[PDB]
Design a protein around this ligand. Structure first.
Ligand SMILES: [Zn+2]
Ligand SMILES: [Zn+2]
Ligand SMILES: [Zn+2]
Ligand SMILES: [Zn+2]
Lengths: 395, 404
């Protein structure tokens, strides 16, 4: 068909309705466990006609950076969204204003395709819908969709569900339910769906709660498939326990530690995230005031138990492909079971109602890539290559 | 209060029966999930009176090397057992470390007995019991052969009758349950000063944390932990290594065939791949772990092999003997020219041709690498004098000397 070029990648416009799903916080085990548990029959047999792969997401393994990467088919060094915020002013990249590249989404639309985007959280929806002319809304604000703004109307009635609670599993279901109704009505050419990792943050793979959620998604996949759509599924990042044997969190307050070593006001620990984790992840940035010597800082931090790696700006930028201008002097990586906080005084841990499970580091990098089709031309796979494979590598 | 010193460590003899338990493959998450699920009420309330900590086991995160360090309070560099076997480039043969004849240090257990202490050791597997019973005068037997138990050798008689159970199958949870049960008998009867209990990771290789079956097994242990505690014993719990999934989203295994790989790069026989996770002869899935060692022929340029291997997706790290020894504290004479570590979700095999994966009913769960290094340290008592990097092999020190 018609071929569009976006961010230096060429894409062949879909002939059949294509659905790219981003399963927030999808550590592979979730899937393996549900199947074993017999709670995902569809995925269980998908191997008969499908393709299951494993790819690497973007580091820092956070939702925004990853989602943006998926829809642009590029890394943060291209789209420029490497976290929820940066420094210089503690500015927030919550606006497309911060977007430095186009989405594949907007291009398909410009080429005349009917593109749809559905996300659980409204905030994402903003970033993703940049320059998009089509259907675009969140489950979070389903109640207020209008034709002009969102390309749709009365989705609540259509879906047969009330506005869900942000801190509910219902938020994600809504996403799937909405995607079904659009498929069977409007029949978009391309649809992008994105959930929240609310469940994954609260439950580990293999638990009733987790299995149940997966059982729900599996049903939707089945139905999408039954509709003749092409279904492509991935995740933005993985997920892990960040606790001891009894559920107590393994935290390292970098700000506190740094302040003690070099004296307060001398360093600036930034946590590119913001209840799921109480802003606790395995990745952080550090800004050094002239007073402190990078060499020293590295040695110091690196020797702290729980730190996985200390990278300089250049190191990180090149290794992870990030924008040098929106990253600190140092990049700190947390170990498998460790999260990094700023200062103790600045965190509300009393909100943690269950043992902490988070992401951000390298141990939440492995993510799945699943198709309900067979593929061709397979040569280091990234989660943001999903669209590529879905539009160009079909057998 | 008697003081002894072993392997350069001082230890105060127990005043109360102390029981040190090694829960094989006890990834921390198993405890967390069992508690969250209502299946571990005793452990669930232990914080209020006990102590929960985290340590690093020895890498390779294997069963024998670890258990051995626990009982000697030292690394393999000291006791010598750094795997199931090794390769002697003097004899050009495969050397099986299945005999206490390979031990380079004394066990703390043996010493406590020398000092007049009544010391019991109960393992699930009999093979372990042999290494552990080195120079030990006390009670020592395995559930696996709780059959052939005589007074002269084991220090006990008719344990089956005592426990009220039959001899359990190796490939089962009962195997481990027996251990506990037998430990309860001894405690209530012989009441040893010191006891060491060691299970098998059968269940953990099969079920993930939070699974009905995982939780069940955990609920069983909790029950004994409580009984021991109600008897007044000091209960200290750790693990030999954690456990992880070694598959993809659908449960297919992540396997690297290092022999195959190397052979294709260097040709047949220029390298030798050893998987010390078990005895050299085993070819089943039981032989796949996230650590392997490699012997290079003189012809093969070491740096090159490092680069080659280091470049294969799924290999976390490749280290030379020297680096490996220093870093993990291993005996240089019993490891290969190279040490290969695999990523979190990856295992290392030798040659496809060799392995028999027919036995893998369920998706692969294994260990041996840095991703299975974190382990718990649990005590039913408050502790004091805590000074850097806790090891599982510091358990005895803590349990004997750090009691509050
Ligand atoms: Zn996410
Ligand atoms: Zn999250
Ligand atoms: Zn073990
Ligand atoms: Zn094992």
């Amino acid at each position: 068909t018609n071929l569009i070029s976006v961010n230096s990648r060429s894409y062949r416009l879909s002939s059949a309705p294509t659905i790219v799903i981003c399963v927030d916080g999808c550590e592979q085990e979730y899937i393996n466990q549900a199947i074993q548990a017999g709670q995902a029959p569809f995925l269980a047999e998908l191997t008969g006609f499908g393709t299951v792969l494993t790819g690497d997401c973007v580091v820092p393994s956070f939702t925004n950076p990853n989602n943006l990467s998926i829809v642009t088919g590029a890394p943060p060094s291209v789209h420029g969204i490497c976290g929820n915020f940066f420094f210089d002013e503690e500015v927030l990249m919550n606006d497309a204003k911060y977007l430095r590249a186009p989405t594949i989404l907007a291009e398909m639309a410009k080429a005349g395709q009917l593109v749809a985007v559905v996300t659980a959280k409204d905030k994402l929806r903003n970033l993703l819908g940049h320059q998009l002319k089509g259907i675009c809304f969140s489950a979070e604000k389903a109640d207020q969709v209008n034709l002009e703004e969102h390309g749709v109307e009365n989705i609540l009635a259509r879906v047969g569900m009330p506005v869900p609670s942000v801190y509910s599993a219902d938020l994600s279901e809504f996403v799937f339910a909405a995607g079904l109704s659009l498929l069977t009505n409007e029949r978009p050419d391309f649809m992008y769906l994105s959930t929240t990792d609310y469940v994954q943050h609260k439950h580990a793979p293999g638990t009733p709660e987790a299995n149940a959620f997966y059982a729900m998604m599996d049903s939707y996949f089945k139905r999408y498939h039954e509709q003749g759509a092409i279904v492509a599924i991935t995740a933005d990042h993985g997920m892990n326990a960040k606790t001891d044997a009894i559920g107590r969190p393994n935290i390292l307050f970098l700000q506190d530690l740094l302040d003690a070593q070099y004296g307060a006001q001398r360093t600036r620990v930034l946590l590119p995230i913001t209840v799921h984790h109480g802003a606790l992840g395995s990745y952080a940035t550090v800004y050094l005031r002239d007073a402190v010597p990078q060499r020293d800082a590295i040695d110091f931090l690196a020797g702290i138990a729980g730190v996985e790696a200390v990278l300089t700006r250049s190191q990180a930028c090149q290794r992870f492909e990030l924008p040098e201008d929106r990253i600190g002097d140092l990049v700190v990586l947390g170990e498998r079971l460790t999260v990094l906080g700023s200062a103790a005084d600045k965190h509300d841990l009393s909100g943690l109602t269950v043992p902490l499970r988070s992401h951000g580091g390298v141990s939440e990098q492995k993510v799945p890539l699943i198709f309900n089709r067979k593929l061709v031309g397979l040569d280091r796979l990234r989660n943001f290559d999903i669209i590529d494979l879905a539009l160009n590598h079909l057998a």
